[PDB]
Symmetry: C2
Subunit: 108 residues, 2 copies
Amino acid sequence: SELTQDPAVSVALGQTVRITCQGDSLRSYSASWYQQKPGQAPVLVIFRKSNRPSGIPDRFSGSSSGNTASLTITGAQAEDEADYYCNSRDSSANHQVFGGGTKLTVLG
Amino acid sequence: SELTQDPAVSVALGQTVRITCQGDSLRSYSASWYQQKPGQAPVLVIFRKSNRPSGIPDRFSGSSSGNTASLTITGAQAEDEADYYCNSRDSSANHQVFGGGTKLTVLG
Ligand SMILES: [Cl-]
Ligand code: NA
Ligand code: NA
Ligand code: NA
Ligand SMILES: [Zn+2]
Ligand SMILES: [Zn+2]
Ligand SMILES: [Zn+2]
Ligand SMILES: [Zn+2]
Ligand SMILES: [Zn+2]
Ligand SMILES: [Zn+2]
Ligand SMILES: [Zn+2]
């Protein structure tokens, strides 16, 4: 399996941004989403399509439809500037596949 | 790439336990380790062989040797009872490979 996402997007403070991932695995398997900030370990912000791990703000939401999955940030904050990666189970047992990441810039 | 780990081990409160993963990827790429508790998202306890994410207790440590990687918990506490999964970059671009997991039972 393979996944594709746009390499970069911006959002203004307080606006909404949607980051989408596409690939065949997404018809079968739920997407998860990682946030990567400089000097930190990656953080799961969404898993199993739309569930938020403990402590993740509700301004992060996930959805899917068909061969696409999306991460939406509603009311973007300065701290949300990060690289975001979609992932899912891969066709190979015990493997996961990732998108190439989307760099989010938050302006204002 | 593929990774193997023993399915189960135990540790007494206050003792040390080492969970080991084996596979060819580990000679060249660093392992990460996830803790999985029921009803929660997976939590990265070690990444990039030996680094601990923010907030993870220093009783968790990681190492590697040859085609193996190890998670050691020194001074196990009751809350450490969980499933632990090793992972690494896979031979396929943008893929990760995982072991099958090790169920850790903490006794006492
Ligand atoms: Cl500790
Ligand atoms: Na997390
Ligand atoms: Na984490
Ligand atoms: Na127990
Ligand atoms: Zn694949
Ligand atoms: Zn391809
Ligand atoms: Zn297709
Ligand atoms: Zn900036
Ligand atoms: Zn593989
Ligand atoms: Zn095989
Ligand atoms: Zn400590």
